[PDB]
């Protein structure tokens, strides 16, 4: 009884505390302002903004789908001497969604043994076809489907910009199919004729519904398309190629070089980390990260930038991010002025459901301590347009990078032989995390 | 040298003070918030708003032109049993402006002896035809022109709602005429034939320009008009009357009963106060107030309200007035929380150019300390519509009344014989203030 | 612009205190005193006032001190709160001057507390600039060629060495038909920095 009593909200206690807080001037001012305005709007520190909002970077280059294809976009732009160019995002979006839905069916069959109310099954039914993704998932799509110029497959369809409705109708159906499968699996075996047929009818039905909101791309991966365009000089040209060849010959993409590193304090550095069951194309590559310390992570970002290439990275958006001014600084808001401080560290933040990867963006530059030191700030770009941030550009502090960013993607050839071998040895046993790990899909 | 040095802004001093203010938490929070938002929006105290925003009044009735005519409007409404009714404000506005302009010409002639750069002359040239006015000025207009239903003379003309442009063109001309008069007065005498002619041509010219933005009212003060209307019962009626008779017979206005009192701490109470040269109709009544203490002023407001009549009053709008919530409370904003306090008292505020009468409104109710005490709050109404305040209604604290209100208008018959005699004796010599006194025209 | 705006307002407010002391002899209802109480800290200014500010404070690139604060774009509210206080101080001074002399210890202290209070309230709506006039600042920028550079300089040196401003050359002329041409015209008491240059025009 004593314990339960001590754990209850005592009215005298809170009113006594109130009396005490009210006799403090800072508190009296704080609750006047905070009953009137949003804490973020009220506490944004312009004094800090003034010094941190620095758009000078001495090291510069000359959502997940945009960030993963941008470099390939640049490659084509340079390879063909165009004023402007754009790869079709919708092309990959279509197959990503179709693959995820199909993959989900497989996930359901492979877990048919567990109860419906189990952690894994319930998790599978939650968001089977969300738009998020990872870099390995991007590669799984490109290896199978290739790439195509946006001109041949644009974002014309409604659902390409407002997929929520569509996704919802698809998911409702996938939930029906999940029961139909599990039910049929109580009596029949998976490889049983009936099941195989049933699964095919489901693929059919998924594709049918999808074709209602988006057209299947105009050419198959090995089918040639003809592309007419104009270069910087107003001179016209015709390119005849297939999606796969195009991704390779013109986009210059080599699926064997990209590797992603991550700063995940929950586990030892130097070890490989694998996200269980997370994927899109059945039988595709898994989500793998080489866990590393921040110094190493920062240095790799600098090197990639010095090699004149932007850097794909996953972070916790929009933590400590001011969209209006385009600043990512964990000290931009004066929360300590109201006695609000956050001691919980990165590793804990992750384990305790406070921080995760939510979005992929691009690092297009940085400023290094030209004395004899290291990076101070990074130039970041997203695909929200000139409206977000300052003309779409963001400035990120080194500290923000260390605290609320996790993954970066580089070429294995840019890694020290020490770390490169982690991917080539074959001796490394990866730490395997659950499919619902906070270090997963990026929007 | 030492004195001038001590009176200069010293850079070390201010930076040292800054250092000290910055080590104070309340200050650090205050300058974070105040660099982001308007002090009034940031410091509005909702805790105070919660208790002060009380719309219960145990004593209730069942811009200067609207406030002065409202009672007369009510009289007609009741006398004719109408659902709705409105007196023409534009009627009085037209003659007020024409009279002021003419009066200005006289003011210029009577001060022709003083230099052009003198205090009085420069003041006269400042705003000869502003829209403001006082109660005595309202009576001067009604005694000469009478009143008419709005139906016969509405606010159709553009300038009746956006007079700024019009007023400006008029004033530019009045400034030209001022020179023309003064110049002609250097050689000729005022009553001289030439001057008299010149002044008449000026009246002509003023009227001509005015007739371009507004039509002269349709009937003369002693000319009969016929008014068709519908009463509450949908029954139609025709009234044949003149503006003067109408103001008297239907509006029930007796120009001899209204008197205005004022709480002006600069001068002894019980004394009469007169604003020199302030007027509109040449030869009309002067602006006169009987100065009295706040207790008396408050009690008179209660009595008028108990006699079922709203109270015309002049105050300093918009000091401590929240238009969005419709509250007039000098403690509604938590300025002391940022170390901002205002010790200067009423008398001083006036003498030191900090407070003056700026607007006329109406008190339509109040709440008295039902124990054995006095008024706590008043119900106030303006003519800005349901948009301002809460549906157009405001709530004013007793303290606000005492501190930022000055004048009220009552019937001499509602005054104690003691004070009534101040207006009827003939022994009282008024304290005479300059035409530019802060206790003048009300908008 | 905000750099100069901050010191202009702080100086005007301080100057006002001096104007009040120097006219303490005239009645409160006098033409000059009432005029002084009207708009002590309005945003307006003249060229000589600009020079008075630059000679004392120098100049700085906007990048180091922008128009971020609310009041830098909507100063009306702020100015109003400041003025209300300056009107209170005016009485406090005049009152204390009826018995004490200006150079009297008490007055000098009182005036300093007022400067303090003015600065405190001002620091709530705008930060004092980041560097003092003779204090070096470091400025990073990019030229037309995308090439980066770092400049280390103080506000005063910057206004001179990079902005090329020579306070001795600018003079203002005016066409004022009220007075003979060829004559010099001076606006009495109009200023911002106490002891600064006067507003002078050659008609």
Any idea where the domains of chain A sit in the sequence? Answer: 58-443
Q: Nearest 5°: phi and psi at B374?
A: -150, -170
The CA distance from B214 to B285, in Å, is: 26
With tokens 């107030």, the residue in question is B289
Q: Experimental method for this entry? A: X-ray
The three-state secondary structure class of B289 is strand
Closest residue in A to C143 (Cα) is A56
Are B310 and B364 a contacting pair, CB within 8 Å?
A: yes
> Gaps in chain B (C–N > 2.5 Å) come after which residues?
62
Of C21, C166, C180, C12, the C-alpha closest to C83 is C12
The three-state secondary structure class of B123 is helix
Which residue of B18, B21, B25 to mutate against A (max A Cβ within 10 Å)?
A: B25
CA atoms within 13 A on the CB side of C198: 9
Are A128 and A188 a contacting pair, CB within 8 Å?
A: no
DSSP state of C127: P
Of A421, A377, A419, the C-alpha closest to A402 is A377
The CA distance from B430 to B287, in Å, is: 11
Burial of residue C157 (CB within 10 Å: 0-12, 13-18, 19+) is middle
List CB contacts of A225: < 8 A, sequence separation 6 or more.
Answer: A148, A152, A218, A219, A240, A241, A242, A243
What tokens appear for A99 in the block? 């693959």
The residues pairing with B60 across neighbouring beta strands, listed in sequence order, are B365
- Cα torsion A118, A123, A128, A134 to 10°: value is -130
Give the Å distances, CA to CA, from A354 to A2, A120, A347. 32, 21, 10
Are B306 and B59 a contacting pair, CB within 8 Å?
A: yes
Burial of residue A142 (CB within 10 Å: 0-12, 13-18, 19+) is buried
* β A287-291/A258-262 pair status: parallel
Of B248, B238, B245, the C-alpha closest to B222 is B245
Q: Mark out chain A residues that contact chain C at CB-CB < 8 A.
A: 46-47, 49-51, 54, 56, 58
Query: Which residues in chain C have Cβ-Cβ distances shorter than 8 Å to B322?
Result: none
What tokens appear for A52 in the block? 């941190």
Query: Which residues in chain A have Cβ-Cβ distances shorter than 8 Å to B37?
Result: 37, 41-42
Are B81 and B400 a contacting pair, CB within 8 Å?
A: no
Query: Which residues in chain C have Cβ-Cβ distances shorter than 8 Å to A58?
Result: 148
* β B405-411/B311-315 pair status: antiparallel
Q: Nearest 5°: phi and psi at B257?
A: -90, -35
What tokens appear for A360 in the block? 């992929």
Question: Helix/strand/coil (H, E, C) string of chain A?
Answer: CHHHHCCCCCHHHHHHHHHHHHCCHHHHHHHHHHCCCCHHHHHECHHHHHHHCCCCCCEECCCHHHHHHHHHHHHHHHHHCCCCCCECHHHHHHHHHHHHHHHHHHHHHCCCCCCCCCHHHHHHHHCCCCCCECHHHHHHHHHHHCCCEHHHCCCCCHHHCCHHHHHHHHHHHHHHHHHHHHHHHHHCCCCCHHHHHHHHHHHHHHHHHHHHHCCCCCCCCCCCEEEEEECCCCCEEEEEECHHHHHHHHCCCCCCCEEEEECCCCCCCCCEEEECCCCCCCCCCCEEEEECCHHHHHHHHHHHHHCCCCEEEEECCCCCEECCCCEECCCCECHHHHCCCCCCCHHHHHHCCCCCCCEEEEEEEEEECCCCCCEEEEEEECCCCCCCCECCEEEEEHHHHHHHEEEEEEEHHHCCHHHHHHHHCCCCCCEEECCCCCCCCEC
Give the Å distances, CA to CA, from A352 to A339, A340, A344, A437. 22, 19, 9, 12
CB pairs under 8 A between A and C: 18
Give the Å distances, CA to CA, from B283 to A185, A269, B100, B278, B375. 107, 97, 12, 11, 39
Question: Residues in chain B, how many?
Answer: 443
Partner residue opposite C87 with nearest CB, options B7, B30, B352: B352
Which residue of C64, C140, C143, C147 to mutate against A (max A Cβ within 10 Å)?
A: C140
Q: Beta-carbon neighbour count of residue A266 at 10 Å? A: 17
The CA distance from B400 to A435, in Å, is: 65
Partner residue opposite B4 with nearest CB, options C121, C133, C195: C195
Burial of residue A152 (CB within 10 Å: 0-12, 13-18, 19+) is middle
List the chains bordering chain B where 3 or more Cβ pairs fall under 8 Å: A, C
With tokens 């006039």, the residue in question is C133
Contact A36 B32 (CB under 8 A): no
Partner residue opposite A49 with nearest CB, options C68, C130, C140: C68
Of A251, A247, A243, A232, the C-alpha closest to A71 is A251
Give the Å distances, CA to CA, from A254 to A248, B361, C89. 7, 79, 76
* β A311-315/A393-397 pair status: unpaired
Are A375 and A369 a contacting pair, CB within 8 Å?
A: yes
The residues pairing with A363 across neighbouring beta strands, listed in sequence order, are A311, A380
DSSP state of B350: H
CATH architecture of A58-443: Alpha-Beta Complex (3.90)
Contact A43 B37 (CB under 8 A): no
How far away is chain C from the Cα of A97, in angstroms, using its nearest Cα?
A: 42
Q: Nearest 5°: phi and psi at B377?
A: -150, 160
What tokens appear for B442 in the block? 């009300």
Closest residue in A to B36 (Cα) is A42
Of B173, B194, B172, the C-alpha closest to B183 is B194
Burial of residue C19 (CB within 10 Å: 0-12, 13-18, 19+) is buried
Closest residue in B to C80 (Cα) is B354
The CA distance from A103 to A264, in Å, is: 27
The CA distance from B345 to B357, in Å, is: 16
How far away is chain B from the Cα of A14, in angstroms, using its nearest Cα?
A: 17
What tokens appear for A348 in the block? 């804990």
Contact C68 B338 (CB under 8 A): no
Give the Å distances, CA to CA, from C10 to B21, B41, C3, C120. 17, 24, 11, 11
Mark A360-370 as b/e (b = at least 16 C-beta within 10 Å): bbbbbbbbbee
What tokens appear for B310 in the block? 């709203």
């Amino acid at each position: 009884f004593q314990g339960a009593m001590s754990s209850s909200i005592d009215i005298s206690k809170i009113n006594s505390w109130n009396k005490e807080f009210q006799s403090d001037l800072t508190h009296q001012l704080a609750t006047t302002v905070l009953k009137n305005y949003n804490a973020d709007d009220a506490l944004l520190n312009k004094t800090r903004l003034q010094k941190q909002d620095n758009r000078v970077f001495n090291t510069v280059v000359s959502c997940w789908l945009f960030a993963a294809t941008n470099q390939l976009r640049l490659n084509v732009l340079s390879e063909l001497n165009l004023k402007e160019f754009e790869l079709s995002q919708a092309y990959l979006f279509f197959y990503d969604k179709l693959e995820k839905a199909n993959y989900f069916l497989d996930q359901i069959v492979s877990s048919a043994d567990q109860d419906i109310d189990s952690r894994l099954v319930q998790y599978l039914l939650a968001a089977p076809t969300e738009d998020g993704g990872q870099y390995s998932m991007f590669l799984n799509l490109v290896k199978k489907y290739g790439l195509i110029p946006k001109d041949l497959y644009g974002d014309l369809p409604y659902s390409t910009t407002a997929s929520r409705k569509w996704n919802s109708l698809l998911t409702t159906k996938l939930r029906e199919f999940a029961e139909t499968l599990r039910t049929a699996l109580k009596e029949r075996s998976a490889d049983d004729s009936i099941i195989v047929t049933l699964r095919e009818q489901m693929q059919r039905e998924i594709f049918r519904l999808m074709s209602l909101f988006m057209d299947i791309p105009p050419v198959q991966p090995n089918e040639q398309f003809t592309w007419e365009y104009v270069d910087k000089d107003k001179k016209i040209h015709t390119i005849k190629s297939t999606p796969l060849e195009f991704a390779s010959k013109y986009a210059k993409l080599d699926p064997s070089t990209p590797v992603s590193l991550i700063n995940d304090p929950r586990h030892p550095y130097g070890k490989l980390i694998k996200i269980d069951r997370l994927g899109n194309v059945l039988g595709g590559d898994a989500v793998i990260y080489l866990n590393v310390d921040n110094e190493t992570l920062s240095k790799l970002v600098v090197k990639r930038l010095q090699n004149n290439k932007a850097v794909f990275f996953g972070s916790h958006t929009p933590k400590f991010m001011d969209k209006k001014t385009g600043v990512m600084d964990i000290e931009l808001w004066n929360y300590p002025a109201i006695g609000y401080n956050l001691p919980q560290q990165k590793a804990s933040r992750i384990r305790y459901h406070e921080s995760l990867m939510t979005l992929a963006m691009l690092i297009t530059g940085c400023h290094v301590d030209e004395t004899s030191k290291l990076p101070l700030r990074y130039r970041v770009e997203n695909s929200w347009g000139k409206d977000s941030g300052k003309d779409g550009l963001y400035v990120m502090t080194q500290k923000y990078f260390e605290e609320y960013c996790f993954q970066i993607v580089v070429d294995i050839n840019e890694l020290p032989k020490e770390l490169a071998s982690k991917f080539t040895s074959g001796k490394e046993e990866p730490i395997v995390l659950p499919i619902w790990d906070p270090m997963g899909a990026l929007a």
